[PDB]
Amino acid sequence: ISADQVNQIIYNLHHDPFEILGCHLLEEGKNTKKWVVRAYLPKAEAAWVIRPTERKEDPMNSVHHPNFFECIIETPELNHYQLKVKEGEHEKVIYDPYAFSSPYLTDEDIYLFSEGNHHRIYEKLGAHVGEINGVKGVYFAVWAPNARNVSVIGDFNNWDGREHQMRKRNYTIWELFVPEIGSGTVYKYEIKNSEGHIYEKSDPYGFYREVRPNTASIVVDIDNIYQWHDEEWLEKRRNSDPLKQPVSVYEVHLGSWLHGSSAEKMPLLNGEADPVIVSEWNPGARFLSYYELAEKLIPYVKDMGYTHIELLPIAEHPFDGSWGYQVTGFYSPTSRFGRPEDFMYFVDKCHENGIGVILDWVPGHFPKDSHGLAYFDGTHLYEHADPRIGEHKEWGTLVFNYGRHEVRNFLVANVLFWFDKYHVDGIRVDAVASMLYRNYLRKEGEWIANEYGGDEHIEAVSFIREVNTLLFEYFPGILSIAEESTEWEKVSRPVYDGGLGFNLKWDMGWMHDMLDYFNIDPYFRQYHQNNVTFSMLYYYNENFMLALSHDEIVHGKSNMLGKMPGDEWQKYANVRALFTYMYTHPGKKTMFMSMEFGQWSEWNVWGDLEWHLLQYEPHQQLKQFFTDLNALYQQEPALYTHDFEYHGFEWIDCNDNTHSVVSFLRRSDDPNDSLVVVCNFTPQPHSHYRIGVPEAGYYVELFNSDAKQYGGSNMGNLGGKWADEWSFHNKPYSLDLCLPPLAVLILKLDPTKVP
Ligand SMILES: [Mg+2]
Ligand SMILES: [Mg+2]
Ligand SMILES: [Mg+2]
Ligand SMILES: [Mg+2]
Structure with a gap:
């Protein structure tokens, strides 16, 4: 692009920025195409074009002005991309603001939808506020390939569709532009089928609807x-x-x-x-x-x-x-x-x-x-x-x-x-x-x-x-x-x-x-x-x-x-x-x-x-x-x-069925974040119940579901317990705990405790 064109963009003198911004074909090769994506990103220092469906990402370069970017990409089709935009220490990922230069369906839109690959089809099907032929209005489009006719009925035409009959494109999609209506328009599609039966449908792609049990769509x-x-x-x-x-x-x-x-x-x-x-x-x-x-x-x-x-x-x-x-x-x-x-x-x-x-x-x-x-x-x-x-x-x-x-x-x-x-x-x-x-x-x-x-x-x-x-x-x-x-x-x-x-x-x-x-x-x-x-x-x-x-x-x-x-x-x-x-x-x-x-x-x-x-x-x-x-x-x-690694969990003992007690460890990256969990699933309290633990030290009673503030009986270990050097559950140290009734304890070693 020339500096003259860039400056027309920067200074808002250009007659139509869509001619230059967005995605444009530069040339066609034998098995591929060369494209440029251009963006004007005021306040951005850097940008990239992401092609997420191809798992690619390409840097954009400043071209003539630090906030005007271009990116040249060779690929057969450049249908799906995002811009990543960096403004100081922050990055955002957006769709290109200049992606769609008309409200109507293009040939390319129809082709992609026919193949099932139009990831943004809802930009063009449904009802969209836009301009066609220089006049602002709403563009409607609906997929109804076997209909004999489709018309837009709504508040704007007193629900009579005769002067708002749609046009069928490519034997598949019906469209219509209606001038001088806008958001808040209430409408339906009136369809005639191949048998001549006439009936009414809400917009499949509609963005807003009357309140149930009313069913008209509403333009947004x-x-x-x-x-x-x-x-x-x-x-x-x-x-x-x-x-x-x-x-x-x-x-x-x-x-x-x-x-x-x-x-x-x-x-x-x-x-x-x-x-x-x-x-x-x-x-x-x-x-x-x-x-x-x-x-x-x-x-x-x-x-x-x-x-x-x-x-x-x-x-x-x-x-x-x-x-x-x-x-x-x-x-x-x-x-x-x-x-x-x-x-x-x-x-x-x-x-x-x-x-x-x-x-x-x-x-x-x-x-x-x-x-x-x-x-x-x-x-x-x-x-x-x-x-x-x-x-x-x-x-x-x-x-x-x-x-x-x-x-x-x-x-x-x-x-x-x-x-x-x-x-x-x-x-x-x-x-x-x-x-x-x-x-x-x-x-x-x-x-x-x-x-x-x-x-x-x-x-x-x-x-x-x-x-x-x-x-x-x-x-x-x-x-x-x-x-x-x-x-x-x-x-x-x-x-x-x-x-x-x-x-x-x-x-x-x-x-x-x-x-x-x-x-x-x-x-x-x-x-x-x-x-x-x-x-x-x-x-x-x-x-x-x-x-x-x-x-x-x-x-x-x-x-x-x-x-x-x-x-x-x-x-x-x-x-x-x-x-x-x-x-x-x-x-x-x-x-x-x-x-x-x-x-x-x-x-x-x-x-x-x-x-x-x-x-x-x-x-x-x-x-x-x-x-x-x-x-x-x-x-x-x-x-x-x-959660999803072996490291993060290990049973301490799960054999005491007769007292419905189980215990286990949870771990994280720091060994000092390991937790000891003990569960008592009967109402029988235990004044002394030994549980194997991996290290010496003081184990704080970090949580106790029988605490009084939770409605419990307030039984437990009054702050915590020092481990004994008393092998148990195949571990070298053990705690002699009080287990409250119908309750779970979570304990955690405090390696800085004063002995
Ligand atoms: Mg009628
Ligand atoms: Mg009530
Ligand atoms: Mg079910
Ligand atoms: Mg069973």
Whole structure:
């Protein structure tokens, strides 16, 4: 480029910066092409072009001005890249601001989508505010290859589409530009099928939607509604390995955590809306907005000491009682709680408070509602036409055709969309088995095998691998969490090793073992010591997340207190012992709302949590217990640096079944960070109980779940114990401990103690 051209850019004299900025073809070679990427990055000292799908990174050079950058790259196609931008000591990674020089679909957009590889397809499908022919308006586009006609109906045309008939491009996608309308336009697509039947559809790629049960889509100028402040969070995430950090998740269903009064408006980030009543049977209650949740949930979670909030599915869904798991508006956060910018504000405020956001994401199926994706264009478009692979008959839902390029693209670009536009830090996928198996919940003779004769759903496995490959390439330090309940191998292993590419898997076996164990009267736990210890036998085959989820406190299973045997004191004590054990056992942590304060009743999605219980001491004490346990977890490296290495754990003794005692070490990089954990799972106290330890010295009683401030009896070791040079459990030293009833101790050597 010349200095004249650069200076026109620097000084805002250039007539159209897209002519020069962004990605431009310089020449074509025999088997490759030479491209230049240019950027004007005021205040940046350095920049790079990352090509994350090729695992490449190329420096940019300043050209004529220290803040104007160019990068020349030879490659056949330069479709997917990011800019890394360094401004002083800080780096950010963004998409190129000059990536897309028109609002309309290009030939290249259509080709990539036809192949299933358009990772940013949501920039062009849906509804986007833009300019065509010099006039500002909205560009609409929708994939409906077998429709006979499609028209845009909406508020702007009184729902009559005759003068807003779309144009079909390349026999596949319909488009229309509508001048002088903008954000907040309410619309649907009116489709005529090959039989001549006329019907109405919400926008698959819509960014916002009316409030259930209304279904119209709403135009959002998605890149001009919110200003983020989370660049330092994002940089730390990108440059960190979350597997080596504390990860303690508070699982939340946004609709049912806390309700407000339906007698007043729902406040939003600078504005308000009509209240969204929770149900016709509880009409004085409304949902809180994403704004109000930012103001109330976030400081609540920060004070409790969790590292992450995991949301049950926030994508648009028509029925409260699905909990979010039956989604019809994949590209929009539900309007139950306000607007897209209110959810952005929520995530930005989490990041400000040092809390990450994990979304339950639902790629496995979709319901049959007429406004949604079903039978979209008069054919089985999103779902597979064969019900043996295209329906989950026991659920009444439809299964995506994962092998179909445009369907795969809808879902792969969807997962990326939430990281891009909403800055989320992870995803969790429920019921991954539902996708993996061609015989899932199907009777003999009502499914067919794969091309090799097996039950593996090959197209779904390919899709899951593609999602995880891409997600970690574009967003390296995220969490991708699976619940898979059939012992599929290598769920949380890299795709190149034959894994499915998740980085964490819920330890469902652990969860069953623990809850079944604690439900047993304590005298009888001696016949079930194997529930305590078995999950370590297969533990190192996956990277496990220890999750006690919403699914365990519904349908007659009771909430946590109710699962426990004994009198009220003992029920509380059992809860504290279980969760102390959970937080000391190797693996990351997840627990659901209401578990932290001892709600007696099961979770009810139609009401809110029983907050009045926190007026009473026993619930306050349990909540203080969790507050302190989360604080300890973040403070003790041996509870989180080596979760997934042999070094990080070793049983001391797990043979005393008759007294339901087990003990173990946790380790980290510094030997002085090793912890001694001792568990007593009966109400029998032990005044003298010997436990082998590796070193001489004073072992501080760092945590004691029977402490009085947690509701316990206050039994224990009054600060700590000096080890004896008395070999025990195959260790050269030992502690003679007092073990409180239905409790866990964590001890830690203080090598600086005065003898
Ligand atoms: Mg009409
Ligand atoms: Mg399940
Ligand atoms: Mg058993
Ligand atoms: Mg209530």
